[PDB]
Ligand binder design. Structure first.
Ligand code: MN
Ligand code: MN
Lengths: 351, 351
């Protein structure tokens, strides 16, 4: 019920929401492994596959983490999160050229700031919307900062309860910018059984002004396609130009072929989803005309004999004077003439 | 909400319902073009692709239609419905051998009776459940007959309003047999835009004891996969051993490859669908440990100085004494010692 709404906002010229074509965000993320060259190759692959939006991650490691980060290992790598972010991070000059390049290909560039300095770098660049990752969903100070920039926010909600998300959404509303909530599970990769697509409806019922989507880290497109069937408006998967690239997120990334598959499925499900059972489909009319049943004589019935459940039955097609709906209303009427076995009962056959 | 239920029943040894693996019904239908040989080839192809259930149509043309049927043409052929059914119908001997053959391959055989004589033929054969097609959804006399057989009913609901379906469901309940409702659109093939998957939820809210599914006549699997994401339990598509066969339903039929695709997608979506947003996923724990932020000093703070929003900030990872959740609670506390810029605030750092 709640995901079928008219909520919408714009990311540059692209309208997003239930009544619009679903938007697939290609998250290049840290997939370029810190090489501007590789990022360009991945942008090209995304452009050529028909992508509309390319999303980056903005890492300024010194403002993003304290020295404790050098001693903690993520679940999908074997060195510290600090080492990974330091190796992968693009400096400001390079991130500016990356945005310029994505925009040169007619695509929208957005990014996820992981820190205050990251957020301020992106505001200087003037990006059209901000993604907040699940890690920062409960980082209320960072959300305050980002919301003050006056751009729409796409908030990922993994690792956070409805009540925790509420505090983030209050800050966003107070700032007066529109937002989307992406349901998300941050296990790299995500087992099918942990996706819980019903979480999207949980989010929509709690936050009726939110545009709703899915960010996904499973091995394929099924989860995202399911999210589109349920009403999702934004789909996010990591993206790579090819699956033999190194990096911790490559495994759950889409490539050009699987992007195109998702785009086509998303289009199909956008059209198929929603609507109402009772809507009359013009195209069904011919089928109804032959497939519905009319009342027929099940026996020779003499003039003056009573019609009954023993001498009446129903058969296709639907053009007889009495529809199967009216079968029992004929019980006890009297034959106005001889009625031939197998003939449709006519209005002139009854007194 | 309503499709997530514990409703179930058995078709022979196969349990069907939201809490069970979705069931794909391979409708051979009239695809054999009246040849027992061809039907066997299609059964073999279904068995080898991993099908669980093969569904037939039982046509006894004389009890199914009056002479008017020889003058009406369906929307996906160019001769009368009578001519098509007469050419395609298997006689009783052949239908008995077809059931025997499907059961010899360890599969379940069910059928759709299109008439009273068809229904009685199938009762003599002792099929384990009955499908009622959309045409007969409102054929209340036929539904009464079929329900009296004491087997579960799978009812297709195309071309019929919730109110019309109600009358059919009342008859089924009175008979005391369990049932499923399949949402359906009878246009061959169905445009994506006419599918209206939300009709499944309309059916579940109106009929809370019903097992719910989709019968589909689109050109591919997207609709069915969407139905599984929403909670659907039974999927029905026409089936052929190959796509170069003649016949009016071949166009929208699945073949062995597309059956297997649907089976795998259905399995994936069965696992992914439903659930709750607030459920704590054990597998997310490592990510939370590195991705959440702790309060840090944003400046050198001398012993005795007050903590504030100017000399405090937040940074990854999440192992500090104060979580980002507690950031503002530190405002106005007094430094118990020199606090180093960038260090996590500890409990021993405050008076
Ligand atoms: Mn991600
Ligand atoms: Mn059909």
């Amino acid at each position: 019920g709640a995901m079928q709404n008219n909520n919408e906002f714009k990311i540059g010229n692209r309208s997003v929401g239930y009544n619009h074509e679903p938007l697939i965000i290609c998250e290049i993320g840290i997939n370029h492994e810190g090489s501007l060259k590789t990022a360009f190759e991945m942008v090209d692959a995304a452009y050529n596959a028909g992508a509309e939006v390319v999303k980056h991650q903005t890492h300024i490691v010194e403002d993003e983490m304290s020295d404790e980060a050098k001693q903690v290992i993520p679940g999908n790598a074997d060195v510290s999160i600090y080492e990974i972010m330091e190796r992968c991070a693009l400096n400001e000059e390079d991130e500016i050229k990356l945005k310029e390049y994505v925009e040169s290909k007619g695509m929208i560039f957005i990014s996820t700031p992981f820190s205050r300095a990251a957020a301020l770098r992106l505001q200087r660049m003037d990006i059209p919307a901000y993604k907040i990752g699940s890690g920062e969903c409960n980082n209320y100070p960072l959300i305050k900062l980002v919301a003050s920039f006056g751009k729409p926010i796409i908030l990922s909600t993994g690792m956070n309860s409805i009540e925790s998300i509420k505090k983030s959404v209050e800050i966003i509303r107070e700032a007066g910018v529109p937002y989307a909530l992406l349901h998300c599970t941050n296990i790299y990769p995500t087992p099918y059984e942990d996706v819980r697509l019903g979480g999207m409806n949980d989010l929509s019922e709690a936050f009726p002004d939110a545009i709703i989507g899915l960010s996904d880290h499973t091995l394929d497109n099924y989860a995202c396609l399911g999210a589109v069937a349920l009403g999702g408006s934004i789909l996010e998967r990591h993206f790579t130009d090819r699956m033999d690239r190194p990096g911790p997120d490559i495994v759950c990334s889409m490539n050009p072929d699987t992007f195109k598959e998702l785009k086509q499925g998303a289009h199909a499900l956008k059209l198929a989803r929603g609507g109402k059972k009772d809507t009359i489909i013009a195209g069904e009319k011919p089928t109804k005309d032959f497939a519905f049943a009319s009342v027929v004589a099940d026996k020779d019935i003499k003039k003056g004999e009573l019609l009954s459940g023993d001498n009446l039955w129903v058969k296709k097609p639907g053009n007889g004077d009495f529809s199967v709906n009216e079968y029992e209303t004929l019980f006890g009427k009297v034959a106005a003439c001889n009625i031939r076995k197998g003939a449709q009962i006519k209005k002139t056959d009854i007194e």
